[PDB]
Amino acid sequence: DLSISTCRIMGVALVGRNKNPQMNFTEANEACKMLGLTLASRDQVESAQKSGFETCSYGWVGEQFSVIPRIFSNPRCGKNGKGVLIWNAPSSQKFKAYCHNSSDTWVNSCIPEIV
Numbered sequence: 001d002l003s004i005s006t007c008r009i010m011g012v013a014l015v016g017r018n019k020n021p022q023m024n025f026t027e028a029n030e031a032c033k034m035l036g037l038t039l040a041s042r043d044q045v046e047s048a049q050k051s052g053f054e055t056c057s058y059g060w061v062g063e064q065f066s067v068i069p070r071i072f073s074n075p076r077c078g079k080n081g082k083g084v085l086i087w088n089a090p091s092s093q094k095f096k097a098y099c100h101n102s103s104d105t106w107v108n109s110c111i112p113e114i115v
């Protein structure tokens with residue numbers, strides 16, 4: 001089974017396997033596709049981070065590198081960095097995936113508009 005962000009921010013979800021090993025670049029694209037999504041771009045993860053999205057996992061994006069979005073500093077997540085941090089790695093390296101849902105328009109898929 002796959003782990004997925006409970007609430008997507010600017011259409012972005014972190015997607016990973018429930019146990020290691022995680023996913024090379026090809027596997028990451030395939031995982032998003034199996035969910036009916038696409039691999040997110042760096043720009044899409046940056047937009048999510050600016051809207052409050054952070055994780056403790058590096059994940060593949062469409063530019064063929066991996067990123068981690070960080071808002072608070074934690075030594076276990078991006079070595080206390082803040083921002084969208086980049087990891088240039090071979091396409092064979094295992095990471096999670098950032099997927100983008102083009103049907104999302106709410107900033108947070110769990111927070112509706114006022115009804």
Ligand SMILES: *[C@@H]1O[C@H](CO)[C@@H](O)[C@H](O)[C@H]1NC(C)=O
Nearest residue numbers: 023024025026027091092093
């Ligand atoms: C990615 O993993 C798949 C197995 O799911 C493998 O067939 C493929 O060669 C791998 N690609 C790279 C670049 O490591």
Ligand SMILES: *[C@@H]1O[C@H](CO)[C@@H](O)[C@H](O)[C@H]1NC(C)=O
Nearest residue numbers: 035036037101102103104109
């Ligand atoms: C994508 O978003 C739509 C609309 O919010 C939702 O119904 C659908 O389940 C989402 N799919 C995934 C894989 O998140």
